[PDB]
Amino acid sequence: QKDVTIKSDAPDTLLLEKHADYIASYGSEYCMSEYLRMSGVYWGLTVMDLMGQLHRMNKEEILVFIKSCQHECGGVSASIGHDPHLLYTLSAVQILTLYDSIHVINVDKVVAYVQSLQKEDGSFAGDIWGEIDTRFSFCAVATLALLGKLDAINVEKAIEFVLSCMNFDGGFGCRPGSESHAGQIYCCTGFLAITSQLHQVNSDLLGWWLCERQLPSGGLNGRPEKLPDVCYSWWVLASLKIIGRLHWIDREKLRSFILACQDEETGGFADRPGDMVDPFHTLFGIAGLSLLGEEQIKPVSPVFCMPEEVLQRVNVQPELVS
Amino acid sequence: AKRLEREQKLKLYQSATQAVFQKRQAGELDESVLELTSQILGANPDFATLWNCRREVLQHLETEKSPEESAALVKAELGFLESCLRVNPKSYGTWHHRCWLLSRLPEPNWARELELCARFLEADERNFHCWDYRRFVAAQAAVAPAEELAFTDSLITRNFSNYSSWHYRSCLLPQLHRLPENVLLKELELVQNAFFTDPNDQSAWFYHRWLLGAELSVEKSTVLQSELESCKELQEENKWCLLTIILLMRALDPLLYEKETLQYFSTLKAVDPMRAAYLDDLRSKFLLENSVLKMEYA
Ligand SMILES: COc1ccc(S(=O)(=O)N2Cc3cc(C#N)ccc3N(Cc3cncn3C)C[C@H]2Cc2ccccc2)cc1
Ligand SMILES: CC(C)=CCC/C(C)=C/CC/C(C)=C/CC/C(C)=C/COP(=O)(O)OP(=O)(O)O
Ligand SMILES: [Ca+2]
Ligand SMILES: [Zn+2]
C-alpha cells in the first residue's frame, strides 16, 4: 500500500515537443554521468527517433564518437578513454542500427568481444572483470541478433543459464537464486524471444506476477510492496508484450501514471510525479506509451527497445507468444 | 551559496579524472592514482572504469611491493568500499569490486562480510545487490541452507521486509531435499499462518500459489478444504484470499465447484478491477478446462 497519490495538477497530456527539446538540448549530472555516455546517447536517440525527431541530433558526430570508443578487443566503451563493456557495446550497435551505419565499427571484433564474455554455464560477464548478470545475457544476444551473428555464442548453454534464473513466482533475477525483478524479467524474456524459447516461460503465471506490479495510482513497481516508477512502464510492459499478456494491466490507469511523471516546464519524465526528470526515464515513459498504442509515438520493438521500423529494415523481429 | 561549493567539487573531480587518464596512458600505476580515483569514486561510485583502474593498480603494486604494503592496501581498500557503499548501496561496480577483492584474499573474513550484509539489510531489507552479495558470501563460506533459512526465519517474523526473504526461503528449502508432500503440507501451515497476521501481506499469497501449483489425499484434500473455509472466514474484500479460494476449488474438484468458481470470479473482479482482464482470461481458461473434463463423461 506504499504508493504515490496522483495530484489534480499532474500533467494529463502528452508533451512531445518539450521532450524533443529537452533531449535535443541535453548537456549544455551530465558531468558525473560520462561513464554511461554511450547508453545515454542511445537513450536520447531512441526516444527522439520514436518521436520522429532523430534528425535534430548529430549523426556524423555520433558516428565518430562510437568509432573512437571501439577498443582494439572489439568492445565499446561508454566514452573516450573509458573501458569497453557489454552495455555500451549493445548501445553502440543499437545506435549504428538506428543509423544504418554498422560498417562504422569492426563487426567481427564486436562479435568476438561478446563471444569472449560467455562463461562455462552459459552466462555472460559484462566485461573482463566478470560480473555475471542476466542483463548481460540479454545484451550479448541482443547485440549478436542485430549483427546476424547469434550463432557465435553457445545458445543452449545460454538458454539454460537464463532458465536457471527463473523463480517460484514465474519471474527472473540477476543470477541463479536472485529475487524476481521486472528489470531482469525484461532481460530474460527479451533473451528467450531472441533465442526462440518463449514456450519455456509460464506465461499466465509470470503475466500475473507482472500485472500485479500495477498499483492503485496506476503506476508500476518492479517487485512486490515497492514504490512505482515510470521506467517499469518499460520493464513490465515490454515483458508482457513479449509473452502476449500486455492487456493484463490496466492501460488507462498506467497511461495516467506515465503522463503524471512528465515535467511540464522542462520536459522529460521523472521516476515519479514532481521529481527531477532524466533521459532514461524519458525514454521509458515514451517507450511505455508506445507499447500501449500512443499515436504520436512510433511503435517500438518490446525486445530491442527501438522503433519497429528500424528492425523491419534489418529483418530481425523475434516471434513473440501472442 | 550551495552552487559555489558544488562547482568546487565538479572542478576537482573534473581535474582528478583528467589526471587519472593522463597517468593511465603513461602507465603510472601507483598510489597517486589510488588517491585520485579515491576522490572521484567516493563522490561517484558508478564510475566503473575507475574500479577497473584501482584493480589494475592494486595488481601492479601487488608485486612490486611488500606483502605488508599490499596488506595495508587491501585494508585501506575494504574501508573505502564500505564508505562507498554507505554513499551508494546500489552500485553494481562498488559491490562487484568488493566481490573481486574478497575473492582474491588468501584468508578472507566471511563472518564480517555476513555482518555487513546484516547492516545493509537493516538499512534496506529489499536491497537485491545486498541479497546477491549475501548469497555470494554464503557460497564462498559454504554456509549451509539451514543456517540461512534461520536468518530468513528471523527477518520475516520479527519484521515484515518479507518478499526478498520469502524468496530466499523458496530457494533454500528445496536445497534441504513436486516438493515433498510432508514439507508441502508443513509450508501450507506456515503460510496459512502468515495470512492470519497480515492477510494483506502478499509474499505468503504468492508463495502459497506456488505451493498449490507444486494423489490428493485425505491428508491434502482435507487441508485444502480446511484452507478453503479458513479463507471463507477471512473473506469477511481481500483479493488474494478470493483468488486463492478459486484456485483451491480448482485444486479440489473444478467440475463440482464450477458454479462457485463463477461466483468468486465476479466478487474478485469487483474487489480488484485492475486485474479484470487477467481474471477474465483465467476464468475462460478454467471454463474451457471444464468443458474438456465434461467430455470425459460417456
Ligand atoms: C542519478 O542516479 C543514478 C543511478 C544509477 C545510474 S545507472 O546505474 O547508470 N543506471 C541507469 C540510470 C540512468 C539514469 C539517467 N539518466 C537514471 C537512473 C538510472 N538508474 C537508477 C534508477 C532508475 N530508476 C530507478 N533507479 C534507482 C538505473 C541504472 C541501471 C540501468 C542501466 C542501464 C539500463 C537499465 C538500468 C545512473 C544515475
Ligand atoms: C535495450 C534496453 C532498454 C536495456 C538493456 C538491458 C539492461 C541493462 C537492463 C537493465 C534492467 C534492470 C535491472 C532494470 C531495473 C532498473 C531499476 C528501476 C532499478 C532499481 O531497482 P531497485 O534497486 O529494486 O530499486 P526500486 O525498487 O527502488 O525501483
Ligand atoms: Ca542533425
Ligand atoms: Zn526508474
XYZ file of C-alpha atoms and ligand atoms in Angstrom:
689
model
C 0.000 0.000 0.000
C 3.087 2.252 -0.300
C 2.157 4.075 -3.490
C 2.099 7.595 -4.845
C -1.064 9.587 -4.830
C -1.504 11.427 -8.100
C -2.472 15.075 -7.726
C -5.053 17.213 -9.536
C -2.358 19.356 -11.165
C -0.279 16.441 -12.612
C 0.014 16.664 -16.410
C -2.672 14.651 -18.261
C -1.411 15.437 -21.781
C 1.480 14.104 -23.956
C 4.139 16.875 -24.229
C 6.214 15.614 -27.170
C 7.669 18.997 -28.242
C 9.041 19.554 -24.718
C 10.503 16.024 -24.619
C 12.162 16.622 -28.027
C 13.650 19.945 -26.852
C 14.664 18.527 -23.510
C 16.536 15.712 -25.270
C 17.893 17.827 -28.135
C 19.336 20.279 -25.637
C 20.616 17.826 -23.043
C 24.113 18.501 -21.671
C 24.792 22.177 -22.481
C 24.709 15.145 -13.697
C 25.921 15.292 -17.266
C 29.362 15.503 -15.956
C 29.062 12.833 -13.343
C 27.385 10.562 -15.925
C 30.045 10.360 -18.660
C 30.560 6.761 -17.525
C 27.172 5.848 -19.165
C 27.501 8.267 -22.028
C 27.209 5.789 -24.942
C 23.940 4.493 -23.397
C 22.661 7.991 -22.693
C 23.320 8.682 -26.349
C 21.286 5.522 -27.243
C 18.537 6.579 -24.861
C 18.389 10.048 -26.407
C 18.454 8.872 -29.991
C 15.895 6.156 -29.445
C 13.357 8.430 -27.720
C 13.963 11.141 -30.420
C 13.532 8.685 -33.237
C 10.351 7.135 -31.679
C 9.097 10.716 -31.526
C 10.111 11.395 -35.165
C 12.911 13.817 -34.239
C 16.099 11.858 -34.832
C 17.363 14.476 -37.393
C 17.768 17.007 -34.613
C 20.768 15.143 -33.245
C 24.247 14.850 -34.700
C 24.626 11.730 -36.732
C 28.157 12.390 -38.097
C 29.436 13.478 -34.702
C 27.989 10.387 -33.039
C 29.361 8.059 -35.751
C 32.819 9.437 -34.942
C 32.354 9.137 -31.129
C 31.371 5.495 -31.486
C 34.363 4.624 -33.664
C 36.647 6.323 -31.115
C 35.006 4.161 -28.427
C 35.643 0.826 -30.121
C 38.664 -0.661 -28.414
C 41.090 -2.998 -30.208
C 39.403 -6.028 -28.461
C 36.233 -5.068 -30.257
C 34.247 -3.933 -27.194
C 32.876 -0.409 -27.000
C 33.328 1.998 -24.055
C 30.767 4.418 -22.636
C 33.088 7.214 -23.650
C 36.609 8.107 -24.716
C 39.346 6.785 -22.501
C 36.818 4.608 -20.661
C 36.989 0.825 -20.719
C 34.891 -1.337 -23.025
C 31.771 -3.002 -21.628
C 28.930 -5.141 -22.966
C 26.379 -2.471 -22.028
C 27.871 0.216 -24.263
C 28.594 -2.421 -26.845
C 24.849 -3.085 -27.111
C 24.106 0.626 -27.034
C 26.597 1.454 -29.773
C 25.319 -1.357 -32.020
C 21.759 -0.172 -31.436
C 22.763 3.427 -32.328
C 24.530 2.235 -35.536
C 21.435 0.190 -36.345
C 19.260 3.305 -35.700
C 21.569 4.941 -38.225
C 22.199 2.031 -40.577
C 25.916 2.605 -40.093
C 27.060 -0.859 -38.923
C 30.153 -0.600 -41.101
C 31.420 2.202 -38.871
C 32.835 -0.256 -36.362
C 34.579 -3.588 -36.755
C 31.647 -6.068 -36.639
C 33.837 -9.116 -36.492
C 35.590 -7.775 -33.350
C 32.355 -6.835 -31.606
C 31.212 -10.417 -32.252
C 34.441 -11.801 -30.855
C 34.263 -9.451 -27.846
C 30.728 -10.723 -26.999
C 31.756 -14.290 -27.720
C 34.620 -13.839 -25.196
C 32.312 -12.926 -22.303
C 30.318 -16.135 -22.139
C 31.071 -18.469 -19.270
C 31.073 -22.226 -18.888
C 27.484 -22.200 -17.520
C 26.246 -20.016 -20.468
C 26.075 -16.799 -18.524
C 27.711 -13.543 -19.662
C 30.118 -11.233 -17.824
C 29.623 -7.569 -18.650
C 33.320 -7.310 -19.076
C 36.696 -8.897 -18.346
C 36.217 -8.274 -14.605
C 33.498 -10.947 -14.616
C 30.270 -9.553 -13.112
C 27.533 -12.041 -14.025
C 24.014 -10.734 -14.564
C 21.060 -11.758 -16.710
C 21.290 -8.179 -18.123
C 24.413 -9.358 -19.901
C 22.729 -12.456 -21.266
C 20.283 -10.071 -22.919
C 22.950 -7.612 -24.021
C 25.019 -10.409 -25.544
C 22.207 -11.942 -27.663
C 20.549 -8.637 -28.423
C 23.891 -7.355 -29.822
C 24.526 -10.505 -31.897
C 20.941 -10.718 -33.193
C 21.363 -7.200 -34.613
C 24.607 -8.293 -36.286
C 23.128 -11.549 -37.604
C 25.718 -13.344 -35.505
C 23.729 -15.122 -32.768
C 25.392 -18.419 -33.757
C 28.723 -17.012 -32.473
C 27.657 -17.927 -28.896
C 26.608 -21.162 -27.195
C 22.822 -20.710 -27.339
C 21.803 -23.869 -25.491
C 24.043 -23.173 -22.544
C 22.886 -19.525 -22.694
C 19.201 -20.582 -22.535
C 19.925 -22.970 -19.724
C 21.628 -20.330 -17.622
C 18.710 -17.947 -18.109
C 16.089 -20.603 -17.331
C 18.067 -21.331 -14.140
C 17.308 -17.695 -13.001
C 13.603 -18.430 -13.227
C 11.892 -18.399 -9.845
C 8.946 -19.823 -7.894
C 6.772 -16.863 -8.843
C 7.451 -17.386 -12.616
C 9.889 -14.436 -12.830
C 13.632 -13.992 -13.238
C 16.503 -12.417 -11.268
C 20.104 -11.347 -11.912
C 21.635 -14.639 -11.191
C 20.565 -18.119 -10.121
C 18.845 -17.695 -6.674
C 18.004 -13.975 -7.155
C 14.623 -12.419 -6.438
C 12.377 -11.810 -9.449
C 12.582 -8.184 -10.649
C 10.724 -6.674 -13.596
C 14.089 -5.421 -14.876
C 15.643 -8.831 -15.086
C 12.376 -10.290 -16.390
C 12.618 -7.884 -19.360
C 16.133 -9.146 -19.968
C 15.234 -12.826 -19.710
C 12.028 -12.581 -21.736
C 13.853 -10.493 -24.281
C 16.554 -13.127 -24.353
C 14.134 -16.020 -24.790
C 12.403 -14.082 -27.584
C 15.699 -13.724 -29.374
C 16.510 -17.415 -28.864
C 13.012 -18.789 -29.680
C 12.348 -20.189 -26.210
C 9.247 -18.428 -25.089
C 7.355 -21.738 -24.710
C 9.527 -22.197 -21.630
C 8.052 -19.206 -19.885
C 4.937 -19.931 -17.803
C 3.107 -17.026 -19.341
C -0.077 -16.938 -17.235
C 1.885 -17.108 -14.047
C 4.601 -14.642 -14.985
C 1.950 -12.461 -16.648
C 0.053 -12.442 -13.387
C 3.142 -11.564 -11.358
C 3.834 -8.784 -13.858
C 0.331 -7.339 -13.811
C 0.366 -7.320 -10.011
C 3.194 -4.725 -10.397
C 0.418 -2.196 -11.029
C -0.539 -0.175 -8.007
C -3.737 1.803 -7.232
C -2.186 5.013 -8.610
C -1.894 3.119 -11.878
C 1.886 3.096 -11.604
C 4.059 0.007 -11.772
C 6.721 -1.250 -9.396
C 9.485 -3.778 -10.044
C 8.549 -6.217 -7.348
C 6.046 -6.731 -4.532
C 5.423 -3.914 -1.995
C 7.916 -1.487 -3.565
C 7.196 2.043 -4.874
C 6.188 2.627 -8.503
C 8.475 4.146 -11.121
C 7.789 5.108 -14.735
C 10.727 3.190 -16.066
C 8.847 -0.015 -15.067
C 6.344 1.048 -17.646
C 9.044 -0.295 -19.898
C 10.358 -3.279 -17.966
C 6.904 -4.716 -17.163
C 5.115 -3.819 -20.398
C 7.937 -4.997 -22.642
C 7.887 -8.295 -20.761
C 4.089 -8.611 -21.066
C 4.014 -7.777 -24.749
C 6.662 -10.402 -25.286
C 4.661 -13.174 -23.590
C 1.445 -11.890 -25.083
C -0.268 -10.616 -21.892
C 0.079 -6.854 -22.323
C -3.672 -6.457 -21.835
C -3.347 -7.789 -18.248
C -2.569 -4.340 -16.893
C -4.997 -1.509 -16.704
C -3.792 0.561 -19.633
C -5.621 3.815 -18.802
C -4.505 3.994 -15.199
C -0.959 3.252 -16.283
C -1.153 5.859 -19.023
C -2.427 8.383 -16.424
C 0.609 7.473 -14.267
C 3.098 7.865 -17.112
C 1.826 11.316 -18.158
C 1.716 12.338 -14.466
C 5.500 11.791 -14.420
C 6.272 14.460 -17.016
C 7.780 17.798 -16.069
C 5.570 20.366 -17.816
C 8.160 23.159 -17.506
C 11.439 21.471 -18.551
C 10.187 18.407 -20.378
C 11.391 14.912 -19.711
C 9.805 12.278 -17.437
C 10.808 11.504 -13.821
C 10.621 8.143 -11.967
C 7.547 9.559 -10.192
C 5.486 12.740 -10.492
C 7.107 16.036 -9.440
C 10.663 14.605 -9.296
C 13.596 15.749 -11.421
C 13.489 14.325 -14.885
C 16.253 12.497 -16.663
C 16.775 10.997 -20.183
C 16.465 7.351 -19.091
C 13.031 7.892 -17.503
C 12.149 9.984 -20.546
C 12.923 7.114 -22.950
C 10.996 4.548 -20.841
C 7.959 6.787 -20.351
C 7.768 7.248 -24.138
C 8.599 3.609 -24.952
C 5.971 2.515 -22.373
C 3.354 4.748 -24.007
C 4.233 3.348 -27.401
C 3.780 -0.163 -26.080
C 0.252 0.842 -25.066
C -0.560 2.319 -28.515
C 0.017 6.102 -28.282
C -0.472 7.563 -31.739
C 2.259 10.228 -31.901
C 4.922 7.679 -30.993
C 6.390 5.186 -33.420
C 5.748 1.511 -32.437
C 8.725 0.128 -30.507
C 10.053 -3.375 -30.533
C 9.336 -4.790 -26.978
C 12.546 -6.818 -27.337
C 15.017 -4.271 -28.695
C 13.544 -1.036 -27.403
C 13.995 0.559 -30.821
C 11.416 1.648 -33.391
C 9.758 -1.348 -35.062
C 10.590 0.140 -38.484
C 14.338 0.071 -37.842
C 14.112 -3.668 -37.086
C 11.834 -4.257 -40.104
C 14.657 -2.808 -42.209
C 17.273 -5.218 -40.786
C 14.782 -8.173 -40.736
C 15.385 -9.090 -37.038
C 11.950 -9.437 -35.412
C 11.682 -12.306 -32.905
C 8.360 -14.063 -32.860
C 6.528 -13.413 -29.593
C 3.959 -15.505 -27.729
C 0.627 -13.903 -28.749
C 25.697 29.550 -1.876
C 25.202 25.808 -2.477
C 26.241 26.211 -6.164
C 29.630 27.567 -5.152
C 30.706 24.595 -3.006
C 29.396 22.098 -5.645
C 31.105 23.807 -8.611
C 34.154 23.495 -6.304
C 33.551 19.753 -6.255
C 32.973 19.361 -10.002
C 36.204 21.329 -10.674
C 38.245 18.934 -8.530
C 36.550 15.730 -9.804
C 36.958 17.055 -13.322
C 40.721 17.737 -12.910
C 41.283 14.461 -10.979
C 39.644 12.460 -13.795
C 41.919 14.133 -16.357
C 44.991 13.371 -14.309
C 43.882 9.740 -13.882
C 43.550 9.254 -17.636
C 46.857 11.042 -18.307
C 48.533 8.849 -15.689
C 46.896 5.798 -17.276
C 48.145 6.069 -20.887
C 51.609 6.878 -19.469
C 51.175 3.800 -17.225
C 51.597 5.404 -13.780
C 50.011 2.500 -11.902
C 50.794 3.929 -8.459
C 49.386 5.128 -5.133
C 48.803 8.560 -6.769
C 46.059 7.017 -8.960
C 44.560 5.128 -5.988
C 44.423 8.581 -4.322
C 42.934 10.347 -7.345
C 40.301 7.651 -8.005
C 39.548 7.741 -4.233
C 38.480 11.321 -4.598
C 36.322 10.501 -7.629
C 34.778 7.163 -6.689
C 33.874 8.412 -3.205
C 31.654 11.021 -4.829
C 30.634 8.804 -7.787
C 30.777 5.046 -7.104
C 29.204 4.161 -10.545
C 32.357 5.276 -12.435
C 33.111 1.719 -13.486
C 36.338 2.413 -15.362
C 37.761 3.754 -12.078
C 37.050 0.495 -10.197
C 38.842 -1.149 -13.139
C 41.802 1.231 -12.676
C 42.038 0.616 -8.941
C 42.064 -3.090 -9.636
C 44.917 -2.697 -12.116
C 46.971 -0.568 -9.718
C 46.461 -2.977 -6.786
C 47.577 -5.819 -9.101
C 50.550 -3.799 -10.362
C 51.567 -2.644 -6.858
C 50.690 -6.149 -5.610
C 54.052 -7.466 -6.907
C 56.497 -4.542 -6.743
C 55.530 -4.091 -3.065
C 55.904 -5.991 0.179
C 53.136 -8.375 1.261
C 52.919 -5.958 4.225
C 52.419 -2.931 1.885
C 49.899 -4.993 -0.162
C 48.018 -5.935 3.027
C 47.821 -2.241 4.033
C 46.357 -1.526 0.605
C 43.738 -4.289 0.924
C 42.586 -2.906 4.334
C 42.590 0.646 3.035
C 40.543 -0.649 0.060
C 37.862 -2.532 2.085
C 37.155 0.567 4.133
C 36.969 2.722 1.017
C 34.434 0.150 -0.392
C 32.250 0.260 2.675
C 32.413 4.043 2.696
C 31.409 3.987 -0.985
C 28.509 1.540 -0.272
C 27.184 3.814 2.513
C 27.149 6.510 -0.212
C 25.571 4.320 -2.955
C 24.455 0.991 -1.590
C 23.107 0.053 -5.087
C 26.312 0.485 -7.091
C 26.862 -2.659 -9.168
C 30.558 -1.953 -9.617
C 31.122 -0.995 -5.960
C 29.600 -4.339 -4.877
C 31.384 -6.273 -7.592
C 34.691 -4.550 -6.734
C 34.200 -5.921 -3.193
C 33.458 -9.318 -4.753
C 36.698 -9.220 -6.726
C 38.579 -8.057 -3.658
C 37.263 -10.713 -1.285
C 37.555 -13.487 -3.894
C 41.294 -12.818 -4.186
C 42.066 -12.607 -0.466
C 44.043 -15.533 0.903
C 42.247 -15.512 4.141
C 39.008 -13.598 3.976
C 36.754 -12.857 6.924
C 33.304 -14.017 5.699
C 31.662 -13.628 9.152
C 32.476 -9.925 8.983
C 31.052 -9.900 5.432
C 27.840 -11.572 6.596
C 27.587 -8.985 9.371
C 27.994 -6.248 6.750
C 25.066 -7.823 4.783
C 23.114 -7.686 8.119
C 23.802 -3.953 8.425
C 22.948 -3.234 4.793
C 19.749 -5.299 5.063
C 18.847 -3.288 8.188
C 19.100 -0.094 6.140
C 17.312 -1.645 3.093
C 15.846 -5.092 3.569
C 14.890 -5.281 -0.159
C 18.329 -4.328 -1.445
C 18.806 -7.082 -4.056
C 22.518 -6.217 -4.515
C 22.978 -6.980 -0.862
C 20.954 -10.245 -1.025
C 23.088 -11.287 -4.008
C 26.284 -10.374 -2.212
C 24.932 -12.253 0.785
C 24.447 -15.362 -1.383
C 27.907 -14.809 -2.816
C 29.272 -14.725 0.733
C 27.226 -17.748 1.907
C 28.591 -19.783 -1.025
C 32.243 -18.572 -0.542
C 31.894 -19.503 3.162
C 29.868 -22.650 2.469
C 27.087 -21.562 4.829
C 24.507 -24.351 4.803
C 20.872 -23.951 3.697
C 19.502 -24.308 7.279
C 21.677 -21.538 8.762
C 20.483 -19.155 6.020
C 16.903 -20.407 6.459
C 17.171 -19.384 10.169
C 18.419 -15.941 9.173
C 15.376 -15.735 6.890
C 13.103 -17.025 9.676
C 14.335 -14.090 11.847
C 13.808 -11.333 9.181
C 10.208 -12.246 8.239
C 8.791 -12.936 11.660
C 10.245 -10.113 13.746
C 9.556 -7.708 10.925
C 7.871 -7.649 7.575
C 10.544 -6.701 4.921
C 9.238 -10.000 3.669
C 9.270 -10.638 -0.071
C 13.067 -10.794 -0.558
C 13.307 -13.057 2.484
C 10.417 -15.397 1.483
C 12.076 -15.692 -1.936
C 15.333 -16.680 -0.407
C 13.342 -19.301 1.557
C 11.816 -20.520 -1.692
C 15.366 -21.314 -2.922
C 16.874 -22.532 0.314
C 14.127 -25.060 1.096
C 14.428 -27.328 -1.932
C 18.145 -27.457 -1.077
C 17.186 -29.420 2.069
C 15.605 -32.179 -0.090
C 6.760 -31.680 -6.793
C 8.441 -30.918 -3.417
C 7.857 -33.477 -0.623
C 4.184 -33.892 0.403
C 5.257 -33.726 4.085
C 7.125 -30.423 3.515
C 4.408 -29.015 1.247
C 1.693 -29.513 3.907
C 4.104 -28.094 6.538
C 4.538 -24.947 4.363
C 0.807 -24.778 3.830
C 0.774 -24.374 7.639
C 3.484 -21.664 7.946
C 1.864 -19.771 5.056
C -1.769 -20.266 6.109
C -0.474 -18.880 9.453
C 1.230 -15.998 7.625
C -2.087 -14.745 6.286
C -3.671 -14.514 9.664
C -1.331 -11.775 10.814
C -1.281 -9.718 7.695
C -3.739 -11.234 5.253
C -2.745 -8.173 3.164
C 0.996 -9.052 3.107
C 1.350 -10.510 -0.406
C 4.524 -12.697 -0.055
C 2.617 -15.506 1.697
C -0.053 -15.423 -1.042
C 2.432 -15.565 -3.947
C 4.259 -18.305 -2.137
C 1.090 -20.254 -1.355
C 0.119 -20.240 -5.116
C 3.467 -21.877 -5.877
C 2.728 -24.426 -3.143
C -0.648 -25.299 -4.703
C 0.804 -25.391 -8.240
C 3.604 -27.611 -6.943
C -2.827 -38.076 -5.038
C -4.988 -35.691 -3.486
C -5.020 -37.472 -0.267
C -7.365 -37.370 2.557
C -4.401 -35.561 4.197
C -4.074 -32.907 1.485
C -7.709 -32.554 0.231
C -8.688 -32.049 3.875
C -6.013 -29.440 4.372
C -7.243 -27.772 1.097
C -10.946 -27.945 2.186
C -9.815 -26.602 5.546
C -7.827 -23.823 3.761
C -10.930 -23.040 1.700
C -13.068 -22.483 4.799
C -10.315 -20.619 6.691
C -10.264 -18.473 3.561
C -14.073 -18.007 3.599
C -13.942 -16.743 7.232
C -11.237 -14.311 6.158
C -13.390 -13.041 3.228
C -15.340 -11.251 5.948
C -12.629 -7.604 0.255
C -9.183 -9.165 0.265
C -8.359 -10.011 -3.374
C -5.574 -12.503 -2.528
C -7.851 -14.644 -0.374
C -10.554 -14.607 -3.123
C -8.174 -15.687 -5.914
C -6.840 -18.421 -3.617
C -10.358 -19.870 -2.986
C -10.908 -20.172 -6.767
C -7.583 -21.819 -7.131
C -8.340 -24.130 -4.152
C -11.740 -25.103 -5.664
C -9.841 -25.672 -8.886
C -7.355 -27.704 -6.905
C -10.225 -29.738 -5.375
C -12.976 -30.562 -7.929
C -13.330 -27.963 -10.729
C -16.449 -29.578 -12.258
C -18.135 -29.757 -8.860
C -17.265 -26.153 -7.953
C -17.859 -24.610 -11.360
C -20.824 -22.643 -10.006
C -18.885 -21.219 -7.084
C -15.792 -20.573 -9.240
C -18.010 -18.311 -11.341
C -19.436 -16.563 -8.204
C -15.925 -15.905 -6.957
C -14.662 -14.546 -10.240
C -17.461 -11.954 -10.009
C -16.658 -10.843 -6.455
C -12.926 -10.808 -7.249
C -13.383 -8.576 -10.316
C -15.278 -6.017 -8.227
C -12.597 -6.079 -5.482
C -9.612 -5.986 -7.891
C -10.837 -4.240 -11.056
C -7.272 -3.506 -12.280
C -6.894 -7.230 -12.827
C -10.245 -7.551 -14.729
C -8.567 -8.723 -17.984
C -6.382 -11.335 -16.255
C -9.325 -12.705 -14.275
C -11.404 -12.932 -17.452
C -8.723 -14.963 -19.205
C -8.251 -17.119 -16.130
C -11.955 -17.730 -15.997
C -12.028 -18.526 -19.754
C -9.174 -20.970 -19.303
C -10.910 -22.686 -16.394
C -14.206 -22.814 -18.232
C -12.511 -24.468 -21.243
C -10.548 -26.898 -18.974
C -14.004 -27.882 -17.598
C -15.615 -28.417 -20.929
C -12.748 -30.783 -21.729
C -13.449 -32.541 -18.385
C -17.241 -32.907 -19.081
C -16.294 -34.753 -22.303
C -14.810 -37.476 -20.037
C -18.474 -38.474 -19.430
C -19.940 -41.157 -21.740
C 21.334 9.569 -10.706
O 21.363 8.250 -10.095
C 21.758 7.272 -10.967
C 21.679 5.976 -10.502
C 22.054 4.915 -11.290
C 22.501 5.140 -12.575
S 22.919 3.743 -13.521
O 23.464 2.677 -12.619
O 23.931 4.081 -14.563
N 21.650 3.083 -14.366
C 20.994 3.976 -15.357
C 20.189 5.170 -14.810
C 20.296 6.281 -15.649
C 19.621 7.440 -15.329
C 19.719 8.579 -16.191
N 19.778 9.492 -16.865
C 18.839 7.496 -14.181
C 18.732 6.395 -13.332
C 19.427 5.231 -13.648
N 19.231 4.197 -12.856
C 18.792 4.310 -11.451
C 17.282 4.135 -11.359
C 16.396 4.200 -12.354
N 15.170 4.066 -11.867
C 15.305 3.865 -10.538
N 16.610 3.919 -10.239
C 17.237 3.807 -8.864
C 19.350 2.807 -13.401
C 20.789 2.268 -13.524
C 20.857 0.796 -14.038
C 20.480 0.581 -15.508
C 21.406 0.824 -16.531
C 21.063 0.613 -17.871
C 19.792 0.163 -18.205
C 18.880 -0.111 -17.200
C 19.220 0.098 -15.861
C 22.610 6.444 -13.071
C 22.235 7.516 -12.264
C 17.805 -2.203 -24.548
C 17.484 -1.869 -23.077
C 16.302 -0.962 -22.771
C 18.208 -2.366 -21.992
C 19.331 -3.192 -21.901
C 19.200 -4.235 -20.761
C 19.567 -3.729 -19.329
C 20.968 -3.225 -18.895
C 18.571 -3.765 -18.385
C 18.624 -3.427 -17.045
C 17.334 -3.977 -16.420
C 17.130 -3.580 -14.982
C 17.919 -4.344 -13.950
C 16.202 -2.584 -14.653
C 15.819 -2.064 -13.407
C 16.147 -0.557 -13.259
C 15.670 -0.077 -11.888
C 14.366 0.656 -11.801
C 16.455 -0.357 -10.770
C 16.218 -0.065 -9.419
O 15.643 -1.273 -8.775
P 15.714 -1.422 -7.232
O 17.130 -1.411 -6.783
O 14.872 -2.526 -6.816
O 15.038 -0.121 -6.770
P 13.491 0.123 -6.722
O 12.635 -0.978 -6.195
O 13.579 1.461 -5.788
O 12.980 0.575 -8.212
Ca 21.215 16.550 -37.372
Zn 13.328 4.181 -12.783
